[PDB]
Amino acid sequence: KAIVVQPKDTVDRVAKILSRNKAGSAVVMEGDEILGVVTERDILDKVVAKGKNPKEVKVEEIMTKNPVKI
């Protein structure tokens, strides 16, 4: 299961949404534009392990948005 969230949703909010819905990931949508995806791995690896405060991080900042790239 994945849940659709908005790009300004903060990481603390997104984490609760995912846990309470027993979802593994979110789909980040701005209106009818799908901008990227975010998993619980992204939350732990890009925010928590990185020393960032989840309430100060918008989910757009940690989603997979771009192709792989050297």
Minimum distance of a copy of itself from residue 3's CB (angstroms):
8
Q: Give me the phi and psi of 28, to 5 degrees please.
A: -95, 115
Secondary structure of residue 26 in the 3-state scheme: strand
Burial of 26-35, coded b for 16+ CB within 10 Å and e otherwise, reads bebeeeeeeb
Residues forming the site for a copy of itself (CB under 8 A):
1-4, 11-12, 15-16, 18-20, 22-25, 27-28, 34-41, 43-45, 47-51, 53-55, 64-70
Minimum distance of a copy of itself from residue 8's CB (angstroms):
16
Comparison of 8 and 44: residue with beta carbon closer to a copy of itself: 44
